[PDB]
Amino acid sequence: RSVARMDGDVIIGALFSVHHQPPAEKVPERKCGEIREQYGIQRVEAMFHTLDKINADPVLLPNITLGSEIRDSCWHSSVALEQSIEFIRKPIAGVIGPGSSSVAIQVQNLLQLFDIPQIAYSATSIDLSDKTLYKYFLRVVPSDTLQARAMLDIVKRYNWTYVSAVHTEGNYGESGMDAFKELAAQEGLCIAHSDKIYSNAGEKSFDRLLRKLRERLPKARVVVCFCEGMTVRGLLSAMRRLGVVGEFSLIGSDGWADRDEVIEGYEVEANGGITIKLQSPEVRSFDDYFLKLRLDTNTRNPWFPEFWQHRFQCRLPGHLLENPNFKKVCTGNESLEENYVQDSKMGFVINAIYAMAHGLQNMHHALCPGHVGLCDAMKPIDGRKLLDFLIKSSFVGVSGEEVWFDEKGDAPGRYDIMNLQYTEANRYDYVHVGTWHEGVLNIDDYKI
Amino acid sequence: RSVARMDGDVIIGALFSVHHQPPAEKVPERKCGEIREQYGIQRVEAMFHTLDKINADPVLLPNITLGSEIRDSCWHSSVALEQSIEFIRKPIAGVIGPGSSSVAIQVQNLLQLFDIPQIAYSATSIDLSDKTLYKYFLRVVPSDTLQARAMLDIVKRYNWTYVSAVHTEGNYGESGMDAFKELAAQEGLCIAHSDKIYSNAGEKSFDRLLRKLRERLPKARVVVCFCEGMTVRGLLSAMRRLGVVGEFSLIGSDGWADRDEVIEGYEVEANGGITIKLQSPEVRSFDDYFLKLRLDTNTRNPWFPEFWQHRFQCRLPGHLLENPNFKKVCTGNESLEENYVQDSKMGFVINAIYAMAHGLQNMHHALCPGHVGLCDAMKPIDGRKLLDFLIKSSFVGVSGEEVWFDEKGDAPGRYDIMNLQYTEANRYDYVHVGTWHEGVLNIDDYKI
């Protein structure tokens, strides 16, 4: 399988989802789904961008260059464990990833056997907060303990006390929802029908979903979906299938947030929905970089040739990788500004990329103090040591954000409430309609 | 980490639980608790013994010899996940183990990456039968869907329409039940109340079960149980705790079994119940072998020194494997005859072993025709092939039973239907009252 490499004195491996998950029947041979941009190409071009800049910064790791081994995760343990095994066949320092929470349980379950620290940026699951099993796991994002705390608080808000709960099957959906289920049970929140599904269900299973969800009404009008991105798409997909809409008010975890890949197209039904989104400041910096990219100037990232063929439904033939599921050629001069939208979670990954570096720094100051570069004490890099020296590191984010980790592993997290609707210009836009910091819920009644 | 090795032509690696798992805090360091003879030593000495009787048999594996690489599993996914890595680095043909499904997936998740065929004898969850996920997993034991499929049949046999389903929270119950559930919607069995109880739950919630179950009467005197025995005792506890006896009828899976350490004290409230006892018959030969064991001469199995002292609470002075606890040194001539009880799963263990040999054997008939030992096509062993050679393999057991595997990877099932009644003596016995033999039930319409 193809890897995006970059040499360096230090090597930090990472796992980004560059293709969608593998189709059902192909999971044994592990042929991954199609290419992505937001969870995929941007996160690879972002892992690079921030690493060229880190290294060129005279302050952090003055005479120590950083390298990485970026591999594809496909949002699935097998492809993940596959690539994770490739790290142990220079030896990696730390791993950034993988995509899903559940996946990480798999990713580190193995890493901790070689004492390799791991920093997540999208795993909001709670199970990870436990370090006895996943000792070497840490993240720059906050736990669902908070996110589940507020989703329930967004409910009390409008006097709703009858609401179903659908959750994406896995370790992400179990942990978050079980909480949303304990919390409610304290507040004496009665819940209607409850059910879960696999993000890659048969279009036939989805319909069953809406059936059971519609077979119980009109009491249960509002829904809690602590659910994966497409998992919601699929529910909408069924919505359209049954040609009915405006029936429920959904409430999606950051699985939705303000993504378009979810409602791109199916806008007709995903309205009035309420979403959660960790308040990651837009990375104004990244965009200046992304756009300027070319088909032939970017060689380090092996996926571009394929990624490009898709962003324009054209094709560059002749070179090995080609997508013949199309007709027109490429102008050769396509511009990325067309409908471009920076990954929502984009911020975190960059920072987490920093966190991994700071550790190296705080350690260097500790084990090879007064030395120009790396030293005998630092070759090789002792894992357990790079750990401690991590939890204990803290700095200003890539864009004005305090970033640090508590003893357990988790970090500081806060999110805003998003709403999707029809603005003035003919367009379904995601609208900011309230925020949530430490139990305190702030929405904008007038903006809704 | 200590291993029990044996040299031969083909090495079949295995994972037995020889030590209890390490407590949570001690886990990141892998300090597995105490040595286990029940699910531990009796098997290691059984993995050794069996392989002996096979190299003793001139009918099967005539000139090819089986050797073993037996590693400790600690009934945990990490000490097992660890030892499994010691496998991928003569190489191992097939893995026997481990004992728990929670563990099976973790391991099998890895093994399937390098094409190692794995045969389990203890894992029951339906999760594994989904052979996309684990193409290389197979077992000589039935799946729960099968064990439940019979409980669904002890019910269809009496035209009981409404029923309740309680299952111990976690793997054994949640896995088996989720099947008792499908089968019932498919055959028209309305479920009245389904609820989960962690074995170690309080009387508070252990009681709430009763209040909820009874609430759903008398249109449902049948409470189903895919529970763990303790979840069952606890239910009885509340029974006598509230004053009720003989209200409803329970059907307990092999979790309860015809065990006697489940009804002590609470006998009166449990009479009338129908349980599922997985027929594991006994292996005289093992016992003839185990007993005649001596500390001085069993060197292949490195744990015996550790094992011996524990079993007899004595010490080998000045020896590595030493004990500070008790001080009565060992005579060297003590019989295990004291309270000895043959592992209740020993059979399965063994039938797995054999299976792993038949495959090699039957494969070498095909890939190595007319050749005496191993012929080049088998040097080295191609696992992806050994798989098709195993799956389509079949023999008689060590009890007379017949073994084989369906396409998926699952085997048959044989079940004894036990009923608890008041004997002709001042005691209550688990009376044998019928059997479920590979798709077929046999009830006694006047023996209940």
Report which of B15, B112, B94 is spatially closest to residue A77, judged by C-alpha positions.
B112
Report which of B381, B351, B347 is spatially closest to residue B364, judged by C-alpha positions.
B381
Question: In angstroms, what CA-CA distances link A82 with A46, A85, A103, B42?
Answer: 23, 5, 12, 35
Adjacent-strand bridge partners of B415: B278, B436
Chain A positions touching chain B (beta carbons under 8 Å): 24-25, 27-28, 77-78, 81-82, 85, 106, 109-110, 112-113, 132-133, 135
Cβ within 8 Å, pair A113-B82: yes
Q: Any known ligand binding at A39?
A: yes
Residue with tokens 């950051």: A254
B-interface mutation test, from A113, A114, A129, most B Cβ less than 10 A away: A113
Cβ within 8 Å, pair B113-A24: no
Structure tokens at B159: 């035209």
Q: Contact A356/A326 with Cβ under 8 angstroms?
A: no
Structure tokens at B384: 């992806």
C-alpha span between A357 and A140 (Å, rounded): 13
Contacts of A327 (CB under 8 A, 6+ apart): none
Cβ within 8 Å, pair A109-B27: no
Running DSSP on this structure, what letter comes out for residue B172? H
Question: In angstroms, what CA-CA distances link A55 with A11, A68, A346, A354, A364?
Answer: 12, 12, 20, 11, 15
Which technique was the structure solved with, according to the deposited record?
X-ray
Cβ within 8 Å, pair B113-A82: yes
Q: State yes or no: cis peptide before B369, omega within 30 of 0.
A: no
Closest residue, chain B, to A27 (C-alpha): B132
C-alpha span between B354 and B105 (Å, rounded): 22
CATH number of this structure's domain B143-279+413-448, picked from the four choices 3.40.50.2300, 3.30.460.10, 3.40.47.10, 3.40.50.720:
3.40.50.2300
- The distance of A28 to chain B (nearest Cα, Å) reads 6
- The distance of B145 to chain A (nearest Cα, Å) reads 20
Contacts of B169 (CB under 8 A, 6+ apart): B196, B197, B198, B199, B231
Q: Contact A433/A441 with Cβ under 8 angstroms?
A: no
Strand B137-139 relative to strand B118-120: parallel, antiparallel, unpaired?
parallel
What would the 3-class secondary structure string for chain A be? CCCEEECCCEEEEEEECCECCCCHHHCCCCCCCCECHHHHHHHHHHHHHHHHHHHHCCCCCCCCCEEEEEEECCCCHHHHHHHHHHCCCCCCCCEECCCCHHHHHHHHHHHCCCCCCEEECCCCCCHHHCCCCCCCEEECCCCHHHHHHHHHHHHHHCCCCEEEEEEECCHHHHHHHHHHHHHHHHHCCECCCEEEECCCCCHHHHHHHHHHHHCCCCCCCEEEEECCHHHHHHHHHHHHHCCCCCCCEEEECCCCCCCCCCCCCHHHCCCCCEEEEECCCCCHHHHHHHHCCCCCCCCCCCCHHHHHHHHCCCECCCCCCCCCCCCCECCCCCCCCCCCCCCCCHHHHHHHHHHHHHHHHHHHHHHCCCCCCCCHHHCCCCHHHHHHHHHCCEEECCCCCEEECCCCCCCCCCEEEEEEEECCCCCEEEEEEEEEECCEEEECHHHC
Cβ within 8 Å, pair B133-A81: no
C-alpha span between A255 and A277 (Å, rounded): 8
Collapsing DSSP to helix, strand or coil, B178 comes out as helix
Structure tokens at A178: 């079980």
Resolution of the entry in angstroms: 4.0
Residue with tokens 């559930």: B181
Sign of the four-CA dihedral A111, A116, A121, A124:
positive
C-alpha span between A339 and A64 (Å, rounded): 38
Adjacent-strand bridge partners of B437: B414
Show residues of chain A in contact with B85, CB under 8 Å. 113
C-alpha span between A431 and A144 (Å, rounded): 23
Q: Any idea which fold A1-142+280-412 has?
A: Rossmann fold (3.40.50)
Nearest to B25 among A28, A77, A132 (CB): A132
Q: Contact B230/B252 with Cβ under 8 angstroms?
A: no
Q: How many CA atoms are closer than 13 Å to the CA of A302, on its beta-carbon side?
A: 13
Residue with tokens 């809406």: A210
For the sheet containing B222-225, what is the strand order? Answer: B191-197, B163-168, B222-225, B249-252, B274-278, B414-422, B428-437, B441-443
Q: Contact A46/A105 with Cβ under 8 angstroms?
A: no
Strand A137-139 relative to strand B92-96: parallel, antiparallel, unpaired?
unpaired
CA A47 to chain CA centroid, nearest Å = 14
Q: How many CA atoms are closer than 13 Å to the CA of A93, on its beta-carbon side?
A: 26
Closest residue, chain B, to A86 (C-alpha): B113
- Packed helices A77-86 and B101-111: angle between N→C axes, nearest 10 degrees: 60
Q: Any known ligand binding at A122?
A: yes
A138-168 CB burial, b ≥16 within 10 A, e <16 = bbbbbbbbbbbbbbbbbbeeeebeebbbbbb
How many pairs of residues across A and B have Cβ atoms under 8 Å apart?
39
Report which of B282, B143, B160 is spatially closest to residue B220, judged by C-alpha positions.
B160
C-alpha span between B415 and B434 (Å, rounded): 9
Q: Any known ligand binding at A50?
A: no
C-alpha span between B342 and B267 (Å, rounded): 26
B-interface mutation test, from A133, A169, A193, most B Cβ less than 10 A away: A133
CA A213 to chain CA centroid, nearest Å = 28
Cβ within 8 Å, pair A110-B24: no
Report which of B79, B119, B93 is spatially closest to residue B11, judged by C-alpha positions.
B93
A293-326 CB burial, b ≥16 within 10 A, e <16 = eeeeebeebbbbbbbbbbbbebbbeeeeeebeee
* Intrachain domains B1-142+280-412 and B143-279+413-448 with the same fold: yes
Nearest to A109 among B106, B133, B135 (CB): B106
Angle at alpha carbon of residue B18, lines to B347 and B302, rounded to 5° = 105
Q: Which helix (H) or strand (E) holds B386?
A: helix B383-391
Contacts of B148 (CB under 8 A, 6+ apart): B176, B177, B179, B180, B183, B226, B253
Show residues of chain A in contact with B77, CB under 8 Å. 109
CA B445 to chain CA centroid, nearest Å = 31
Strand A222-226 relative to strand A249-252: parallel, antiparallel, unpaired?
parallel
C-alpha span between B139 and B50 (Å, rounded): 18
Sign of the four-CA dihedral A217, A222, A228, A234:
positive
Cβ within 8 Å, pair B109-A106: yes
Cβ within 8 Å, pair B132-A27: yes
Cβ within 8 Å, pair B135-A110: no
| Backbone angles phi and psi of B402, in degrees to 5 | -105, 135
Closest residue, chain B, to A78 (C-alpha): B109
Closest residue, chain A, to B25 (C-alpha): A132
Report which of A327, B259, A421, B353 is spatially closest to residue B361, judged by C-alpha positions.
B353
Adjacent-strand bridge partners of B421: B429
Show residues of chain B in contact with A27, CB under 8 Å. 132-133
**Domains in chain B: boundaries:** 1-142+280-412, 143-279+413-448
C-alpha span between A181 and A158 (Å, rounded): 19
Cβ within 8 Å, pair B112-A28: yes
Instruction: Give the number of other Cβ atoms within 10 Å of residue B65's Cβ.
Output: 16
Running DSSP on this structure, what letter comes out for residue B29? G
Running DSSP on this structure, what letter comes out for residue B38? I
C-alpha span between A318 and A322 (Å, rounded): 8
Q: Contact B143/B126 with Cβ under 8 angstroms?
A: yes
Residue with tokens 């690879």: A44
Cβ within 8 Å, pair A109-B77: yes
Q: State yes or no: cis peptide before B218, omega within 30 of 0.
A: yes
A-interface mutation test, from B79, B85, B171, most A Cβ less than 10 A away: B85
In terms of phi and psi (left: phi > 0; alpha: psi -120 to 50; beta: otherwise), the region of B57 is beta
Nearest to A81 among B28, B110, B135 (CB): B110
Collapsing DSSP to helix, strand or coil, B55 comes out as coil
Angle at alpha carbon of residue B7, lines to B3 and B8, rounded to 5° = 145
Q: Long-range contacts: A436-439, Cβ < 8 Å, 24+?
A: A436/A150, A436/A153, A436/A154, A436/A276, A438/A414, A439/A149, A439/A150, A439/A153
Show residues of chain B in contact with A109, CB under 8 Å. 77-78, 81, 106
Contacts of A64 (CB under 8 A, 6+ apart): A9, A10, A360, A364, A373, A374
Adjacent-strand bridge partners of A71: A15
C-alpha span between A61 and A166 (Å, rounded): 46
| Backbone angles phi and psi of A189, in degrees to 5 | -75, 110
Chain B positions touching chain A (beta carbons under 8 Å): 24-25, 27-28, 77-78, 81-82, 85, 106, 109-110, 112-113, 132-133, 135
Cβ within 8 Å, pair B27-A113: no
A-interface mutation test, from B107, B130, B132, most A Cβ less than 10 A away: B132
Instruction: Give the number of other Cβ atoms within 10 Å of residue B200's Cβ.
Output: 10
| Backbone angles phi and psi of B143, in degrees to 5 | -90, 160
| Backbone angles phi and psi of B441, in degrees to 5 | -100, 150
Structure tokens at B340: 């000895």
Collapsing DSSP to helix, strand or coil, B429 comes out as strand
Question: In angstroms, what CA-CA distances link B385 with A180, B68, B112, B117, B381?
Answer: 47, 21, 13, 9, 8
Show residues of chain B in contact with A169, CB under 8 Å. none
Closest residue, chain A, to B105 (C-alpha): A106
C-alpha span between A447 and B1 (Å, rounded): 64
Closest residue, chain A, to B112 (C-alpha): A28
Q: How many CA atoms are closer than 13 Å to the CA of A7, on its beta-carbon side?
A: 0
- The distance of A206 to chain B (nearest Cα, Å) reads 17
Sign of the four-CA dihedral B75, B79, B83, B84:
positive
Q: Locate the DSSP E strands across B264-406.
A: 274-278, 395-396, 402-403
B-interface mutation test, from A85, A178, A181, A388, most B Cβ less than 10 A away: A85
Structure tokens at B19: 């030590």
C-alpha span between A104 and A170 (Å, rounded): 12
Show residues of chain A in contact with B81, CB under 8 Å. 109-110, 113
Q: Contact A274/A417 with Cβ under 8 angstroms?
A: yes
C-alpha span between A228 and A226 (Å, rounded): 7
Q: Any known ligand binding at A145?
A: no
Tell me the residue type at B5.
Answer: R
Instruction: Give the number of other Cβ atoms within 10 Å of residue A127's Cβ.
Output: 21
Q: Where are the alpha helices (DSSP H) in B16-133?
A: 42-54, 77-85, 101-111
Sign of the four-CA dihedral A75, A77, A78, A79:
positive
Q: Which helix (H) or strand (E) holds B437?
A: strand B428-437
C-alpha R_g of chain A: 22
Strand A415-422 relative to strand A274-278: parallel, antiparallel, unpaired?
antiparallel
Breaks (C-N over 2.5 A) in chain A follow: 89
C-alpha span between B109 and B128 (Å, rounded): 10
- The distance of A133 to chain B (nearest Cα, Å) reads 7
Q: Contact B91/B11 with Cβ under 8 angstroms?
A: yes
Q: Any known ligand binding at A345?
A: yes
Instruction: Give the number of other Cβ atoms within 10 Å of residue A29's Cβ.
Output: 9
Cβ within 8 Å, pair B109-A77: yes
Contacts of A363 (CB under 8 A, 6+ apart): A378, A385, A386, A389
Cβ within 8 Å, pair A27-B82: no
Question: In angstroms, what CA-CA distances link A113 with A184, A408, B95, B337, B436?
Answer: 38, 19, 20, 41, 44
Strand B395-396 relative to strand A95-96: parallel, antiparallel, unpaired?
unpaired
Report which of A210, A216, A177 is spatially closest to residue A193, judged by C-alpha positions.
A216
Contacts of A25 (CB under 8 A, 6+ apart): B132
Structure tokens at B156: 């269809």
CA dihedral A186, A191, A194, A198 (to 10 degrees): -60
| Backbone angles phi and psi of A94, in degrees to 5 | -145, 155
